[PDB]
Amino acid sequence: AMEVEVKLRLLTAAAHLRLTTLLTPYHLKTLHQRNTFFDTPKNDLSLRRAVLRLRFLQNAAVSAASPSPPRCIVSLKAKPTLANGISRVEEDEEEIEYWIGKECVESPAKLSDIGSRVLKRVKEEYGFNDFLGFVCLGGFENVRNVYEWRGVKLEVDETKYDFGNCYEIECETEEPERVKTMIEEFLTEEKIEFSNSDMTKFAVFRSGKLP
Ligand SMILES: [Mn+2]
């Protein structure tokens, strides 16, 4: 399925602080995310412009009385385009058990035990019989604030790489040009410095430096 989202870079931590402060009345939830990625040592998926990700996440305000495991989501993203602050990608995602997700990080071959259609698709589309040749590339942490604002869900990200923090605003939408304009007018009015995001979080991770 084709996913579309507006993707804007917030240019400083101060801009990000100002934004999160202003959006506080619209706050829906806060997600703590850890993203991990998988490929062959020869970057077979990356060369076919495919990204295979296991995300571990928890709601920061999860009930203290009723604890639950962190959620684990496997996602395959393919045929990406990112230009003019609009990201388009073919995406397939599926939830899996926390414990098996964690074991796949240490042993990517175990990705076949899962019996996940997403991973069956990786095999069939890209010509793998199994994940015996895969490594975990590692990954990074993200704090995602979700807001319900002017009819859309805004996602404000603080991505914490080893080489420093990056800040983004995202919005999933079928009307990216209208929504992008709406967001930009707001940021402009509030003097929150921004630009188009021209790199995915994974690309920034792999570059090993701030964009
Ligand atoms: Mn995104």
Numbering used by the authors: 0 to 210
From the study:
We determined co-crystal structures of AtTTM3 with tripolyphosphate and Mg2+ or Mn2+ metal co-factors in two independent crystal lattices. As AtTTM3 efficiently hydrolyzes PPPi in the presence of Mg2+ ions only at neutral or basic pH, we used two crystal forms grown at pH 5.0 (form A) and pH 7.5 (form B) to crystallize substrate-metal complexes under non-hydrolyzable and hydrolyzable conditions, respectively. In both crystal forms, we determined structures of AtTTM3 in the presence of PPPi and either MgCl2 or MnCl2. At pH 5.0 (form A) we find a triphosphate moiety bound in the AtTTM3 active site. Here, PPPi coordinates a Mg2+/Mn2+ ion that acts as a bridge between the substrate and the invariant Glu-169AtTTM3. The same metal co-factor coordination has been previously found in a Vtc4p AppNHp-Mn2+ complex. In all our structures the catalytic Mg2+ ions can be substituted by Mn2+ ions, for which we calculated phased anomalous difference electron density maps from data collected near the Mn-K edge to confirm their modeled positions. Comparison of AtTTM3 and Vtc4p revealed that four basic residues, which lead the growing polyP chain away from the active site in Vtc4p, are specifically replaced by four glutamate residues (Glu-2AtTTM3, Glu-4AtTTM3, Glu-90AtTTM3, and Glu171AtTTM3) in AtTTM3. These residues, which form an acidic patch in the vicinity of the AtTTM3 tripolyphosphate substrate, are conserved among diverse TTM proteins with different catalytic activities.
